[PDB]
Design a protein around this nucleic acid. Structure first.
Lengths: 418, 1341
DNA sequence: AATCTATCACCGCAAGGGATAAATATCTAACACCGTGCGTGTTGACTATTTTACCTCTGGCGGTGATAATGGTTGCATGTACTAAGGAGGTTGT
DNA sequence: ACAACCTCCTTAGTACATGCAACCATTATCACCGCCAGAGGTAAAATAGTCAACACGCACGGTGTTAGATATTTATCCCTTGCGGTGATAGATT
């Protein structure tokens, strides 16, 4: 029992083992951490860095002895913090989201001091870890050899391992609600506080009449780097928005504006970073991934996207559909009893009709959810592509699907038994 | 019209359906079960008394002595629940038993008896139980969970295609005792009828027919009708009774009586018998296709010649049929071969069995338990018969004999807990007959076939065994003594049945620490239903039999009140209205028909009866001068569902919450939530914790007042009257002659808890809700507790909520909270936790306890007693001492060139290790209690002797109030009897009591009513003549601490675990997540009221959660709290008393679709106003789950909040004054902070504890350990090619003492580098391998 | 990297608020005296500090009982899911 | 002659990962009691001492007076306020 089964030395004390200079705590979202960074409470930094303190006071005179220093180190006194910038200012902390079935469950960063008792976690790597904020945890490991710190920056750093090992889309990527912000900045509307309109200046959201859905148009000269390093210059009329135009601040301008002339849900946004990785270079692709994060947070809230009792519209013409499907079943359950089906085919010959009822209602549902503004124009009838949030939660790819929408706008349908 | 304390609080139901029954006190499977385990029952068959009645009188096997019995007892306690934490010892008292002895004439023939002796003796311990339905065991409420098991007797299942050389399809019959050994009956792979005695290896099923004593044609007469043939005038024929067609593999074609009956292909499986009985058939004629393959059952002969034809057990053939055509003797007896019709497997396995008789069929069973050992003749019989008939090794109870007879369709309402040697024949018949459709499987998970095992039943099952396995020295030495002069006691040991029954509540397989996170969690804990242990399985050695759902759960066991992860379904909870019959089968309330309608004549019915009568669903609806507006009554049975006409119904459900357990019964919109989030709702409300400024669920179901009383967490008027004193720990009342018992003082008392530890280190406290001179009715509420608001439940607080994404923090049910929450000190939680120390038995006896730790951390010492202990009332944080276990160090080497400093030149005082007990690095909060204990002959230490006078003060004061409170009632009764005619009696209520003896009243019997009360007075007050000392020497009590300990010490901490990020929050509708930033009041959105929003939570997640009750609570809470905010403004200016009544009444009066009404016109214009305080929190609401306050009613009630009746509003941003591109979901939600607490779990480490077993770090918060870099975590570094970061974990941060002790200091080298030496966990393995016997060594390169 | 006119405003430069420090007056504390009583000194008789001697505790541990007692205890490893290996032996084949 | 093959024989080799909370019992079983050891007890004398006596002699602390400090009071002074007049900024151009 020191060897044969699970508890043996091989698995409990060798290929995995208990480890010093380490810890764990509950994950928390850290939207002001830059991509190379992680947040750590002052007294956790003190605990994890004791060998730098009970190891440098005796090397500057900043305490009379390591014995007396008990009064000063546990106190978090001023002299601790030169001793810790001498680490922090260029030191790669390692972080961990066990069970590490895949590489990206462990990465390397850089300390930022904070309050509290948590571990603060940069939003683009929260996707790469699959971080699940129900009071589950992550773990921390300090590298202390010069070699481990050299290889952590070179080999384990978030900025330096961005992509899926199975293919090469980013998984260190614009994450859960960040991409609704980017989708919102890149959606457009009828009337729109600007059905066609333009401006620069965020302060003009305080001039009286603007929207990130207002429909800008502009000639933008635009460029595309060749494999040799030269720039294939181009120019085009555009049909765009204020948020699509602001993204020309953030976009690495050696790839052309016309790539932004769409709606940047999770369905699409990864492929901009992927195209940057295929063509420009590493630093340009990191900056383009990182700076999109705060760009999402400046505008994701201002979308006002929700779930609520009239974000849940329903097709009226469900009434007519119930005059088909439940009526088809009504004679078919007689045909069994009058001698024209057995009990068995009759199960399929009614479940298939319940499936056809769900799929009939699912057609009417999409007209009402996406277009049914009917009243008869002129002067009426803005039959535009809808701004229902439950639909937008699926077309942004934020978290929605057709299987959610059926249950929320027409019919929950059918289930399995055990 | 509502009570006297309801003049402070009334809850508004909205529901729709015809309930005539409400919440029963939820705790019965603890309470009534604890009674029936420990009841003097004169003729029942359960509990301690039935265990003794199953073993005693032990009339000895030696024939010379008898240890008789009369009954159990419980008595002689000393600890009480306060000492059962403060000291810690399990709240328990001795089991003692009345025993006897009798001996007869040794010498004479005319007296028949000579000696008789009888007494009590000890036979164990029993834990004790509260009015609250709790127990206290090793400092903590450790409490038994009830079991849901296969009912004892027999089962009949079907292994319908498992595995092996033919994917073998099976059917079986399997014995399952209440206590005992085993037997199964099934078929082998080849297809013989087979058996597994005690479920050991394969035996042919004929063996047990020899053991039970049946010869070959007795086995035929017990299991087979007998086929008959004849030959008449020109043809072959067969002879019949009109049910003998039941299995035939019909290759063939038949007419009988006067039409066709069987045709080519139509296998006549027993389903077909309903062709024949209606038609009286007694003869058939058939093709030769049914005149071969029919085995003749006797020998037959030929008088045409003088010869034979065939012998017994022989087939029929065309030549044999040609000789039978001649024969003269034209008859044949023949066997059934048709499968299931009768199963031929008996006939053929009777020739595939080496055993021969009863002796072989017992000797071969001895081999099946003892291979390679001689089959000792008489023990070969005992070894088998004691599987089912032993004193120790078999029982069923009357319950399991009932299920045995029931699953065999018997009529015998008479029988035994043991089997019988002929009951087994019917178990075998059912197996022989079932195996393609005479019947099917025994309906296993029907909740009247699976059975409950309550708390007292789970304890009873131990006493059904311990009395027949451990009594050895008593059972032995009872044989030997001359018991005319010895006694029914003289060898009974006492050690084991103390701990083995104390700690059956504290370390048993079902007796965990109770879920004391908050009241709702302990209330449902007391009615948890485990599927585990002997009668079920585990989390691990189990499939879906322990995790899934079966439709008889309806009305009985809610499928969502379970833990999550791999623990799913393993433990459940009883639905609010559900109970069990005398068999532990589950039952439910119903409305019931009379003369044409489902009347209010309510009943309760079993799960079995739900499969036998027409129950209408809760949909259905009554009518005017008629019957039902429900034209096509939707109905249900066994958990399934239908549609019927009015002319077809027997019963209906009474409520919807009869299908729902306690945590689920508080979710007001399950009409709008998926089960995956209803599961979370049934647990987040349980993980919730007491908070400094608690506030009620405003939206609600009605259970927000039941769950305040279902564990006594609010005090309630058990008699009632007029309140007479109120204090932060004490309450008393007085009563009148309409109730006042024949000699009492006219009083009740309702005193309250203060600060102690709990099972998840939660705080416990209570506070009053009434005042001096309030009249209160028999059900009015008198106090509040850790999770209430002044007469109703409060597991949390209300907050304003925006359902929108924010600047990143709230992605995945994670939660933003305002700075305003920290300002108000809200969602701060309060805890009580315990830490302790020891002084060991030295060669002298004591050990040291003081404060001397010089020049190591002096401020963390400043707070202590002479005995090295903190003071009650002092604050402590992060590193302070708690108990002074100092220890001197040594270094000692001290030679004339090794005396480097200390021992000549400075710090020439002690080098004490920092080993005293201390506050953990991360804990903060006040010292609340302190204790010292010892072996009792040492009277208790000074720090306990001062605390004696701290506890004595309370009782010394309170008893000096009690004596006055008591006689101010008792003498007020005497005073009243005097006032009834001696009206001048106010000349007497101003005197010494002795001087009332110079008096008289009238020429009428009131005179003698006064006399007899004055005589009775001197006897009555002897109740008071004890009280103070009966607390004192439970403190100055001592206890032994085992050899090795003279003394023990404690300190308790009030840990103020404040609001912080990383801590966890939730709401009732399964939203659960981390607090992910604290936001300034303007760093948040604001409403069309021009006012910010306390919390923000991401709706982009919600469509993946598939639940919408969270939106509906938020919108209905906007009406419910908006009523209270509008009241805060209206109470200032007032405008008109009829305007105060306008809004305050309209809040209740506004409805259109409802069974209830808080009709405030049935209350007065000051009852309207006393209620307004508790309405400023908000309006309390009710709604039976599935009866509820749907969207249209929310959109009506919102005209009191007056904000947009969309529920979706033009939100702004406080930082910028903007307004967003669309209206957004808002409201007020009921929300929670949860005992995951990051506050407690700050666990990092530089270095610390090390496991001597391997030189590796220890692991654990309770060890200040290092944490596991696991094998998967290695795969990431391997995959990266990151060899130095990996090698760091493997040596210089782990078991390599050399590596880690250099690497730590390599900062002082400046050259911060590795310097490893040897992975000690591999050095260990290189000698563990050699200790097994494997040689292992090394080479060089 | 210099020039300035023409912004949004700091200077252009009047007013006035608090401050603190002077002088006064109060407080306390530091001391010097005195008196008490204790730990200032040697001497002396006590009784029981230590030692050794003797007479006679506590506890070291070695030794083994006899009317006769002469077929024993022991309960649950495990019921599942896989499937690789060895074991059997008759025989239809190599 | 052996070879493996048909069949169900039984054997038995395994059962993923990270973490936190808890407290440490049950046995009976004559240890006999005989002997004598160095070995417990204690009397009387070594290794040396007590503390009471009558002396010796001193320190300390509290009562008394003195000293001077401090916090008050007073009143002075400066640095600051807020507005206003009009400043060379910001930054576009030369």
């Amino acid at each position: 029992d020191m060897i044969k089964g699970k508890q043996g030395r091989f698995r409990q004390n060798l290929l995995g083992k208990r480890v010093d200079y380490s810890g764990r705590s509950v994950i928390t979202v850290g939207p002001y951490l830059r991509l190379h960074q992680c947040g750590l409470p002052k007294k956790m930094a003190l605990e994890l860095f004791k060998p730098f303190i009970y190891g440098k006071l005796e090397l500057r005179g900043l305490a009379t002895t390591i014995k007396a220093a008990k009064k000063m180190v546990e106190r978090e006194e001023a002299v601790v913090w030169d001793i810790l910038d001498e680490v922090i200012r260029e030191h790669p902390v390692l972080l961990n989201r066990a069970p590490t079935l895949h590489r990206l469950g462990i990465q390397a960063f850089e300390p930022v001091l904070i309050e509290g008792k948590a571990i603060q976690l940069h939003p683009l790597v929260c996707a790469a870890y699959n971080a699940d904020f129900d009071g589950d945890q992550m773990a921390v490991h300090v590298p202390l050899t010069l070699e481990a710190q050299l290889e952590a920056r070179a080999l384990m750093m978030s900025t330096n391992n961005i992509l899926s090992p199975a293919n090469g889309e980013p998984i260190i990527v614009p994450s859960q609600d960040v991409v609704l912000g980017l989708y919102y900045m890149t959606r457009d509307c009828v009337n729109a506080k600007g059905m066609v309109l333009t401006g620069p200046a965020e302060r003009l959201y305080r001039s009286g009449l603007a929207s990130l859905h207002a429909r800008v148009k502009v000639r933008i000269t635009e460029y595309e780097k060749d494999a040799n390093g030269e720039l294939v210059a181009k120019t085009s009329l555009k049909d765009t928005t204020v948020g699509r135009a602001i993204l020309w601040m953030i976009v690495p301008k050696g790839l052309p504006y016309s790539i932004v002339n769409q709606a940047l849900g999770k369905k699409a946004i990864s492929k901009m970073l992927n195209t940057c990785y295929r063509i420009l270079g590493l630093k340009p692709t990191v900056i383009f991934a990182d700076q999109i994060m705060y760009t999402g947070f400046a505008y994701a809230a201002r979308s006002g996207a929700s779930v609520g009792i009239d974000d849940m519209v329903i097709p009226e013409k469900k009434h007519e559909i119930i005059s088909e499907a439940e009526a088809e079943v009504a004679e078919i359950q007689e045909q069994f009893q009058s001698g024209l089906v057995t009990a068995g085919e009759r199960y399929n010959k009614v479940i298939d009709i319940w499936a056809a009822a769900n799929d009939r209602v699912s057609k009417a549902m999409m007209d009402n959810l996406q277009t049914e503004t009917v009243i008869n124009r002129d002067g009426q009838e803005e039959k535009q592509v809808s701004f229902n949030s439950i639909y937008m939660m699926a077309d942004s790819g934020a978290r929605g699907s057709a299987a959610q929408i059926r249950q929320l706008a027409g019919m929950r349908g059918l289930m399995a038994k055990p | 019209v509502y009570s006297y304390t309801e003049k402070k609080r009334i809850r508004k139901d909205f529901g729709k359906r015809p309930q005539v029954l409400d919440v029963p006190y939820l705790l019965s499977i603890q309470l009534d079960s604890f009674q029936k385990f420990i009841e003097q029952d004169p003729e029942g068959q359960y509990g301690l008394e039935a265990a003794f009645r199953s073993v005693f009188p032990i009339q000895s096997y030696s024939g010379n002595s008898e240890l008789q019995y009369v009954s159990y007892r419980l008595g002689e306690p000393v600890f009480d629940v306060q000492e059962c934490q403060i000291r810690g010892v399990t709240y328990s008292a001795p089991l003692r038993v009345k025993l006897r002895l009798v001996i007869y004439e040794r010498e004479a023939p005319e007296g028949t008896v000579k000696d008789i002796k009888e007494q009590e003796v000890y036979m164990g311990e029993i834990p004790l139980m509260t009015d609250n339905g709790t127990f206290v065991i090793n400092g903590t409420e450790r409490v038994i969970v009830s079991q849901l098991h296969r009912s004892p007797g027999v089962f009949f299942d079907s292994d319908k295609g498992k595995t092996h050389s033919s994917g073998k399809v099976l059917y079986n019959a399997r014995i399952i005792p209440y206590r005992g050994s085993w037997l199964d009956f099934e078929f082998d792979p080849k297809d013989n009828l087979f058996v597994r005695i005690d479920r050991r290896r394969k035996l042919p099923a004929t063996i047990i027919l020899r053991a039970l004593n049946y010869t070959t044609e007795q086995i035929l007469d017990l299991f087979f009708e007998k086929v008959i043939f004849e030959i008449r005038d020109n043809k072959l024929q067969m002879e019949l009774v009109p049910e003998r067609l039941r299995g035939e593999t019909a290759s063939f074609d038949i007419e009988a009586n006067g039409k066709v009956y069987v045709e080519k292909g139509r296998r006549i499986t027993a389903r077909h018998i309903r062709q024949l009985e209606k038609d009286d058939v007694k003869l058939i004629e058939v093709p030769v296709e049914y005149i071969a393959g029919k085995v003749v059952a006797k020998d037959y002969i030929d008088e045409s010649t003088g010869e034979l034809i065939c012998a017994a057990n022989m087939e029929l053939s065309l030549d044999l049929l040609a000789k039978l055509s001649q024969s003269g003797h034209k008859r044949i007896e023949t066997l059934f071969t048709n499968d299931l019709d009768h199963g031929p497997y008996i006939s053929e396995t009777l020739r595939v069995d080496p055993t021969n008789d009863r002796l072989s069929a017992l000797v071969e069973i001895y081999r099946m338990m003892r291979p390679g050992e001689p089959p000792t003749r008489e023990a070969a019989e005992s070894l088998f018969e004691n599987l089912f008939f032993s004193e120790d090794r078999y029982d069923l109870s009357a319950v399991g004999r009932m299920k045995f007879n029931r699953s065999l369709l018997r009529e015998e309402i008479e029988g035994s807990g043991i089997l019988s040697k002929d009951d087994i024949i019917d178990v075998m018949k059912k197996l022989i007959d079932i195996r393609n459709g005479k019947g099917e499987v025994d309906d296993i998970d029907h909740l009247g076939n699976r059975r409950i095992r309550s708390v007292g039943e789970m304890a009873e099952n131990q006493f059904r065994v311990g009395l027949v396995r451990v009594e050895r020295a008593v059972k032995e030495r009872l044989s030997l003594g001359d018991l005319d002069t010895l006694m029914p006691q003289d060898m009974i040991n006492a050690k084991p049945i103390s701990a083995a029954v104390k700690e059956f509540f504290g370390s048993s397989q079902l007796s965990q620490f109770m879920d004391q996170n908050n009241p709702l969690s302990e209330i449902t804990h007391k009615r948890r239903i485990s599927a585990l242990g002997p009668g079920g399985l585990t989390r691990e050695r189990a499939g879906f039999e322990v995790r899934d759902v079966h439709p008889t759960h309806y009305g009985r066991v809610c499928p969502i009140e379970t833990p999550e992860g791999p623990n799913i379904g393993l433990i459940n909870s009883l639905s609010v209205y559900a109970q069990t019959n005398e068999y532990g089968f589950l039952e439910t309330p119903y409305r019931k028909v009379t003369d044409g309608v489902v009347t209010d004549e309510i009943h309760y019915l079993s799960a079995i009866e739900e499969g036998n009568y027409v129950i209408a669903q809760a949909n259905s609806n009554l009518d005017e001068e008629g019957h039902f507006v429900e034209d096509l009554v939707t109905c249900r049975s066994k958990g399934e569902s239908s549609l019927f006409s009015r002319d077809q119904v027997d019963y209906m459900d009474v409520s919807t919450q009869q299908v729902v357990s306690v945590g689920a019964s508080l979710i007001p919109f399950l009409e709008h939530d998926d089960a995956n989030r209803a599961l979370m709702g049934a647990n987040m409300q349980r993980q919730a914790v007491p908070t400094l400024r608690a506030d009620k669920p405003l939206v609600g179901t009605g259970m927000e007042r039941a769950v305040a009383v279902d564990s006594g967490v609010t005090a309630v008027a058990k008699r009632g009257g007029v309140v007479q004193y109120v204090d932060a720990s004490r309450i008393v009342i007085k009563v009148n002659e309409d109730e006042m018992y024949p000699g009492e003082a006219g009083i009740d008392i309702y005193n309250l808890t203060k600060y102690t530890r709990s099972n998840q280190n939660t705080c416990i406290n209570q506070m009053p809700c009434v005042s001096l001179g309030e009249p209160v009715e028999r059900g009015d509420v008198l106090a509040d507790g850790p999770s209430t608001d002044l007469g109703e439940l409060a597991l949390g607080q209300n907050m304003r909520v925006a359902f929108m994404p924010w600047n990143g923090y709230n992605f995945e049910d994670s939660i933003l909270v305002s700075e305003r929450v920290v300002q108000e000190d809200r969602f701060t939680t309060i805890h009580i936790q315990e830490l302790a120390c020891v002084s060991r038995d030295t060669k002298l006896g004591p050990e040291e306890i003081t404060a001397d730790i010089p020049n190591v951390g002096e401020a963390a010492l400043s707070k202590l007693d002479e005995s090295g202990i903190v003071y009650i009332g002092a604050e402590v944080t992060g590193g302070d001492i708690l108990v002074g276990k100092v220890t001197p160090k040594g270094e000692t080497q001290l030679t004339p060139e090794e005396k480097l400093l200390r021992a000549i030149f400075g710090e020439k005082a002690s080098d004490v290790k920092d080993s005293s007990l201390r506050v953990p690095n991360g804990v903060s909060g006040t010292v609340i209690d302190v204790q010292v204990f010892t072996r009792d002959g040492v009277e208790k230490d000074k720090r306990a002797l001062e605390i004696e006078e701290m506890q004595l003060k309370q009782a010394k004061k309170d008893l000096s109030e009690e004596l006055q409170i008591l006689e101010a009632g008792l003498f007020s009764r005497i005073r009243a009897v005097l006032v009834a005619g001696g009206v001048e009696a106010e000349k007497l209520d101003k005197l010494p009591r002795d001087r009332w003896l110079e008096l008289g009243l009238t020429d009428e019997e009131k005179q003698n009513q006064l006399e007899q009360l004055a005589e009775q007075y001197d006897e009555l007050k002897h109740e008071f003549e004890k009280k103070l000392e009966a607390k004192r020497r439970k403190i100055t009590q001592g206890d032994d601490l085992a050899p090795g300990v003279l003394k023990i010490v404690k300190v308790y901490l009030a840990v103020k675990r404040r609001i912080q990020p990383g801590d966890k929050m939730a709401g009732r509708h399964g939203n659960k997540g981390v607090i992910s930033k604290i936001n300034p009041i303007e760093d948040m959105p604001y409403d069309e009221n021009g006012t910010p929003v306390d919390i923000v939570l991401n709706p982009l997640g919600v469509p993946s959660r598939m639940n919408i009750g969270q939106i509906l609570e938020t919108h209905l809470g906007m009406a419910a709290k908006g009523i209270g905010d509008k009241i805060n403004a209206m109470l200032k200016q007032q405008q008109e008393v009829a305007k105060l009544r306008e809004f305050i009444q309209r809040a209740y009066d506004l409805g259109a679709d409802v069974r209830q009404k808080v009709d405030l016109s049935t209350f007065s214009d000051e009852e309207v106003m006393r209620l307004a305080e508790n309405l400023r929190k908000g309006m309390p609401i009710a709604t039976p789950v599935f009866d509820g306050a749907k969207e249209a009613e929310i959109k009506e009630l919102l005209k009191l909040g007056d904000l947009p009746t969309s529920g979706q509003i033009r939100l702004y941003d406080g930082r910028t004054g903007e307004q967003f591109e669309r209206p957004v979901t808002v409201g007020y939600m009921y929300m929670l902070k949860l005992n995951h607490l990051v506050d407690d779990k700050m666990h990092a480490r530089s270095t610390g504890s090390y496991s001597l077993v391997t030189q590796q770090p220890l692991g654990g918060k309770a060890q200040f350990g290092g944490q596991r870099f696991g094998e998967m975590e290695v795969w990431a570094l391997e995959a990266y090619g990151a060899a130095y970061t990996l090698q760091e974990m493997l040596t210089v941060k782990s078991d390599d003492v050399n590596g880690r002790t250099k690497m730590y200091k390599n900062i002082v080298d400046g050259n911060h580098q590795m310097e490893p030496g040897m992975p000690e966990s591999f050095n260990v393995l290189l000698k563990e391998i050699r200790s097994l016997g494997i040689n292992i060594e090394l080479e060089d390169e």
